Amino acid sequence: SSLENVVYNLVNAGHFDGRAGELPCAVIGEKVIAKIQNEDVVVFKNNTPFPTNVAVELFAKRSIRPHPELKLFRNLNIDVCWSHVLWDYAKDSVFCSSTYKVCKYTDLQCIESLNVLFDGRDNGALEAFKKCRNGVYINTTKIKSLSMIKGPQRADLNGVVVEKVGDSDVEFWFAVRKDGDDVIFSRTGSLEPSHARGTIFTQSRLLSSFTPRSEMEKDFMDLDDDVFIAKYSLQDYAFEHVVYGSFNQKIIGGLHLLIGLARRQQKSNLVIQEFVTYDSSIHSYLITDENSGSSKSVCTVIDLLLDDFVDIVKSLNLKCVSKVVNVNVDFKDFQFMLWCNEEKVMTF
Amino acid sequence: SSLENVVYNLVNAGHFDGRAGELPCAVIGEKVIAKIQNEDVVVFKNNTPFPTNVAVELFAKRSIRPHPELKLFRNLNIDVCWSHVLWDYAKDSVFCSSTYKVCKYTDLQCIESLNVLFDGRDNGALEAFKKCRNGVYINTTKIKSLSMIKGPQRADLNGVVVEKVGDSDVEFWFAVRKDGDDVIFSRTGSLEPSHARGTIFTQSRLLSSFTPRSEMEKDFMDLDDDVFIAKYSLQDYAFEHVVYGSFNQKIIGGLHLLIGLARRQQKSNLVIQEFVTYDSSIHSYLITDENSGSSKSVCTVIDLLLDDFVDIVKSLNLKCVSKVVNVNVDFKDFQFMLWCNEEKVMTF
Amino acid sequence: SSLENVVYNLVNAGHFDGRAGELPCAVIGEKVIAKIQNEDVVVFKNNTPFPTNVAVELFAKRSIRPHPELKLFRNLNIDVCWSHVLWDYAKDSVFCSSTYKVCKYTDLQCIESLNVLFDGRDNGALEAFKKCRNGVYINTTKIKSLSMIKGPQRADLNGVVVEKVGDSDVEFWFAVRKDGDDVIFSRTGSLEPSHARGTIFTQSRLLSSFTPRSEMEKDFMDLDDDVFIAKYSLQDYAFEHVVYGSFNQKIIGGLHLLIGLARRQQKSNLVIQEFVTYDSSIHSYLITDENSGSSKSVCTVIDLLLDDFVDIVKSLNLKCVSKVVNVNVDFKDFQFMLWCNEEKVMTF
Amino acid sequence: SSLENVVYNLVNAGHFDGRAGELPCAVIGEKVIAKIQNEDVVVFKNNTPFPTNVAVELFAKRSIRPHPELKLFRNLNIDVCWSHVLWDYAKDSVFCSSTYKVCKYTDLQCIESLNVLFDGRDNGALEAFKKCRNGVYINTTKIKSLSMIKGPQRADLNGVVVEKVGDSDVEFWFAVRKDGDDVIFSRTGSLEPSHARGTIFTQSRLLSSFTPRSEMEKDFMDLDDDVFIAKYSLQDYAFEHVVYGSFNQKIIGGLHLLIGLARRQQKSNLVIQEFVTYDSSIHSYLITDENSGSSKSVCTVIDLLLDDFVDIVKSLNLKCVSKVVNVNVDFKDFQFMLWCNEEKVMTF
Amino acid sequence: SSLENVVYNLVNAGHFDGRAGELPCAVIGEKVIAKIQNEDVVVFKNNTPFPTNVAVELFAKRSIRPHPELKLFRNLNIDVCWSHVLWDYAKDSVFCSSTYKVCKYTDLQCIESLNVLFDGRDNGALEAFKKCRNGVYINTTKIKSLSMIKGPQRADLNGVVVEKVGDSDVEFWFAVRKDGDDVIFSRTGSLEPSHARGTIFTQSRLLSSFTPRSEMEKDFMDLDDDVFIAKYSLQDYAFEHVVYGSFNQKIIGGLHLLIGLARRQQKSNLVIQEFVTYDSSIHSYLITDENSGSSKSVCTVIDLLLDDFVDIVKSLNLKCVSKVVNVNVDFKDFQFMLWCNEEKVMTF
Question: Could you name the active-site residues (chains A, B, C, D, E)?
Fold first, then answer.
């Protein structure tokens, strides 16, 4: 596919349809300029590591169908996508640094040993998957002839996090291969050995539009701290610190759960700076609280349904000093630091 | 500090910690790309006048502690910072065009005659200050062995304007040297001779989040113009023009106080265009009022507590035509044009 | 024509053939990168004012047939070429700043009032010419049904100045139209009125390969100045200055004929700096003579057959102070400053 | 290796030594600027497809030892070099588009199926080679326990073509693997089947410094065409066309042997334009002859020792119309078009 | 001075004259495009570390008068030029990284402690010099009321090394100040203490145009090594190594005098790669000898008149192992490593 055809597709279909046609173009720095009706208009701005003309081709070929949130693939260590490209709207670039059977200039000649993502919706994906050394195969339908594990009920659709598709619940099943063998999933046990059932998933909410998803989260947003803690008997779980956060010192204390930041935002502006910006299970922020003038340089934050967080804390018989509990979130084992006075997610 | 180490610090600490480590990087135009987990991500976008790799080093080394708002240093004509760098978040670049004892590539060899800012929190700052020809020394604690003047109670913390730090009132004291001699501050008099006590300070509010800070400002936002003016006996001070603004002509009339724009925004969208964007005591805008379709090319606007503005107007015995009153704001003498029918800040 | 097809043509044919095919490409700054045999190679470097992808298309579509030297068209004030593009190899860019019926992105919608160059070898050129308001039509064959004037016997062929084509003498005839009327050429008279027969043409030689073209030029290169001057009775024509040049002062004296620089180069290195570099009848150089350390900032130089220069000087009855003789060279009237002691070409 | 360290190495050692140290740097467009003695100097200009900072690292790590000319590896279809990088001085960039065990940012994670070049001088190269699926192993010494074929006696040393190294004859042996099996070389037969012994090698000469390498080439340069042809009985081999070239038409005739261009250059300036510039066995030029004004768009040229060319022509019993003889040159089968009146190398 | 005016000056005068006028311009990457006669032409290509529009202003304001070769100022550690700018033609950029009283955008506000170069030809230079803390003052005439030392008789004139100016010998006198005091020069002694009279100067020749400057250098170029050595009794001074160089090993031996490289070039092509390219007393090259295929990574080379080199070697009573002789060249002390078998200049 040529630049002119790609731009023609982007302008008339919003993405690459494979349709014929051409639009006069000009590449200037990270700008792609198309001449439309004798007028020059910027149709693409390159914020990727690729050459500008190559970047617009990759964006035009981006997947416009719903797919599992990218943080899951990162957690599964996906290296390249088989015959499709995923656009990371938070990152404002492509997901993988390389492609396969997608773009001539960027396609890898060899992916034998890389971790390949195969989407059941692409023709030949399953056959390619069964022959790969390392990979992940996803499908919206549970396949009885494959050992699979279900992902959470939410997808990335054109960068929008949705819980339904066509007004129907989102459903994604996962199959995995490593070193030539299928990973066999059973109903019980932990996904990884000591060093966790794989059912805990982050909620994917944004601070600017956070919304309670249960009655407990609803109370946490409306009731005073004292009231909330007693109602759900969270006595010795130090929520004041870990979840509510303390703003009476130069350095913010706790504040590791997204809903906690959401609650603070109700009475005080929280400004967040993020250095590595892309969909991830655990985020690392430089946080500044306006009202108090308090702040912290590396404040790890995770968006867990509060109900899920409490079950995690009540499962710990905190009666051990410097712990290092492992919690499997979004299919990956994350180590949470647990002093008998704090439960914070660590930087991984 | 190398590019790879700087990027490693930026990614893991949010700023330069001095910690060891390296991340593979790529510089492309104004983009700094880091390879994280075999994925390429843009961690910095250069909107500074410096080379991209140099710009990310300066940003990473930016001050993350609270400091006096930059408009004050501009008013004091600071040329360079001693052993630290201030990031201007409104400008989206570094404050000074040069550095000293911070970055190899940009550090000045000689700063003998420049106006140097010394922050008491940096080791050796006071000694360096006492030996400088021209400079300003700031400290959060009043030093009895230095002649100092207090700044307003608000600071710039990671670009956020805060009135407290650690939930404690912000406090900054200023000491100054010029041509080898200490500036001696007394309790009374004007900071500058005729051509003003240095206690009038701008409020630092943003139109998108403006908030009344007194009962008078509260009334100004809620009561009708007629009601407000009578309540505070502001008869012959022409507030309808200067503070409320008139929108019944092609060219907006008056509208020189920020709270005035804030009030208009309540019923009509005000679109502001600013050509020189950085923290300043007086702003110069190209303003367009949506409801009326009125506008003005160079509308000077200052954010003074309304209570302070009224005291300034009532101190004038306006009974003199084309005046040119001098008002010391944020440590600097600004000339306000005063026709016996208008009081507008002039372009300085 | 698309980028990929253009690059495919450039790589396989050296220019645009109209053949089908595509090569994966990447545009990076002024570099056009093609993937050939899985290898990345720079096939074009943009030194034009056009966007890189547009520049390579224009270069690929460049004329590869012999045509009149560009200095002639500049002298005729050509604004755009009809259905073809001329590449200026000295300039390393396209000749005209605009195109017509050549490139979608750069083609002008209207050229009604511009001076258009029509090449008889392009289909429809003559008909287009006869209908234009202002233009020049060239053909390699003299057309009896058009009033035409012959150009010199040398052409630009892929940037190389040739006197023959296919080992046959170069022949180019010129027809011109202005304000809707054909310019009628007769055998005698001057091309322009007072303010010159149009038979004087520059020789197009390069200093690095200068070659005598007559017996007089041969003698000028081999005989001593004294010997040469007497042999051709050039007593009161001050050749020592104007043609030979004097190098006994800080500022070089005279040196306005190319052959003169050629002769000096025989015993002393002459370094030339040119600020506007493109084929022109008269050049303006910053010249530095190595042996003497003498130099001149704006030294105008013209490459006339010495035999032609002498006929021009002997036609002047220099017995008039500050003259300002007009000499028609390459179809254009150039004013030569003539003090009864110097004959230098002026800056036009 | 960081940017600052790489630049430090480049400046002090000419290449990457692994030595410690740092030089302040600035990356601007394709320029790498180092601050040396408080002065800013451009130490690298990027003409590669890689990010500038990455390009200087690759150049600094370039091989500075003698190695087989790159046209040989291209002929062997090398995809990547194992643990080293080859700089192509004609191309002014790196040879392969990817690296392996050389540069963090550009290294491929997987090269299992690519054609890998292993240089016996790098530790572990032979072991890596014996385990690869597809590759070429070179050594300066003949290894008795490997099936190998000798290359020509000339190497690329810092871009210079040399016949000796340390004043000793250049010697390079080649071992090859394909699809997991060693290629077994015998003393006789053709390297490839019908579709040639692998002993014919190009001479690697440049037109600007061409030098006869035999008595026949010496005569070809000094004797007239008639004289030469009779002396070596080359009657019906049409050298006038194929080797000497004809310049009596618009389109040059023949001229496919480099020595032929060399001979023409003796009396007429030949200007060559090349669109894909990198070391290759057969070149494709746009050629323009100055004296005659003749030219050809795609003139294939090969630099064979004339003695070798004649043996190739005398082996053909040209008594067959449109042939298509296969000649193995530089380890690769090239098809030469042979009409009973012309023998030209085809475009491959 | 504005961009348009600067470009107007560059185009019409070759440099900034201060004349009025404007040319429409466009800045694209490192290209400055001027619209001349409705045609677009690149008049400047930025290879400096400065913004393109700033770079063309600095080039236009470059000194076009003769001045001491830049290697001398580097040796004197000049930091900035007072009221003028020196263009380094070998470097293809400005000499100093900063300016003073030359260009608004790049001028330093403070130069009190920097080493300033004052040229006696600029009005006010001497007065400015006498008031500076650290600086060098040069004049073409010896000033009786200043302690001065004479430089060599050669100057940089528009990048050309000349021995005469206006056909008169080049003459430059040097006066120096350090820490507020004048440096007092006497007729005898060494310029620096132990750690050399300051009369040894490099010859400034280029390999591509090297020319013998004495009878000894003439013999060195024409006579065989044996013949030369005996004629000038250079028995135990190992010239075969140090001056002639040995090419019978992988690594070139000796070859530290420019004339030596010049002599080799007579029978073998020497290819030189230089990483830091600007006028310097001692050069560091990566050298490759074509005929032998020998090479050296860091070969220091100095261009001393052979007569001067021999006097230096005969002054050494080499009867001491690992010496470290100090030789003052171009006003600077350079340490030459002297094993009782080799005399090579060290890397400084």
Answer: 241, 256, 296
Q: How far apart are CA E234 and CA E257, in angstroms?
A: 15
Whether residues B259 and B348 share a domain: the answer is yes
Residues of C in contact with A38 (CB under 8 A): 109
C336 and C214 within one domain = yes
3-state secondary structure of B160: strand
CB contact under 8 A, B113 and E114: no
From chain E, pick out residues whose CB is under 8 angstroms from the CB of D14. 273, 275, 284-286, 297-298
| CA distance, residue D83 to nearest chain E CA (Å) | 21
Quick one: DSSP state of residue A159?
T
Q: Say how far apart CA A281 and CA A301 lie, in whole Å.
A: 9
Task: Give the amino acid at E35.
Answer: K
Interface test with B, best of D105, D106, D110 (most B CBs within 10 A): D105
CATH code (residue E57): 3.30.160.820
Note whether E49 contacts D33, CB cutoff 8 Å. yes
Q: Domain boundary at E44, E64, E84, which?
A: E64
What DSSP string runs through D251-303?
B-B---BHHHHHHHTTTS-EEEEESS-S--SEEEEEEEETTTTEEEEEEEEE-
d(C-alpha D176, C-alpha D146), whole Å? 9
Task: Say whether both E82 and E182 belong to one domain.
Answer: yes
Final residue of a domain: which of E195, E211, E245?
E195
Domain that holds residue E325: 196-348
3-state secondary structure of D71: helix
Beta carbons of D35 and B5 less than 8 Å apart:
no
| CB A130 within 8 Å of CB A175 | no
How far is CA C287 from each of CA C270, C300, D287, E169, rounded to the nearest angstrom? 7, 10, 33, 19
Residue A137's nearest CA partner among A80, A171, A175, A184 is: A175
B147, B182 contact by CB (below 8 A) = yes
In eight-state DSSP terms, residue A268 is S
Q: Which residue has the tokens 């008139």?
A: B246
The breaks in chain A (C to N more than 2.5 Å) occur after 195
Resolution in A: 2.2
In terms of domains, do E240 and E315 share one?
yes
What's the alpha-carbon Rg for chain A, to the nearest Å?
A: 23
In angstroms, what CA-CA distances link D205 with A158, C294, D167, D298?
Answer: 57, 41, 19, 20
* Same domain membership, residue E201 and residue E189: no
Burial bucket for residue E324 (CB in 10 Å: 0-12, 13-18, 19+): exposed
**E248–chain D nearest CA distance, Å:** 5
**What is the Cα gyration radius of chain E?**
23
Of the candidates A84, A256, A283, A332, the residue annotated as catalytic is: A256
Residues 6+ apart with CB under 8 A from B315: none
Are residues B210 and B333 located together in one domain of the fold?
A: yes
Q: What are the start-end ranges of the H helices in chain A?
A: 3-13, 52-60, 70-75, 125-131, 215-222, 225-231, 239-242, 258-264, 306-313
CB D5 within 8 A of CB B1: no
Q: Which chain D residues contact residue E250 at CB under 8 A?
A: 165-166
Residue B304: both structure tokens together: 């003074």
> Same domain, yes or no, for E240 and E125?
no
What string of DSSP letters covers D112-132?
A: TTS-EEEETTSTTHHHHHHH-
- Say which experimental method was used: X-ray
Mutate to test the interface with D, among E275, E283, E291, E292 (most CBs of D within 10 A): E275
Q: Is E213 helix (H, G, I), strand (E, B) or coil?
A: coil
Into how many domains does chain D fold? 3
Q: Are residues A13 and A88 in the same domain?
A: no
Contact between E295 and D157 using a beta-carbon 8 Å cutoff: yes
CATH number at residue E85: 3.40.50.11580
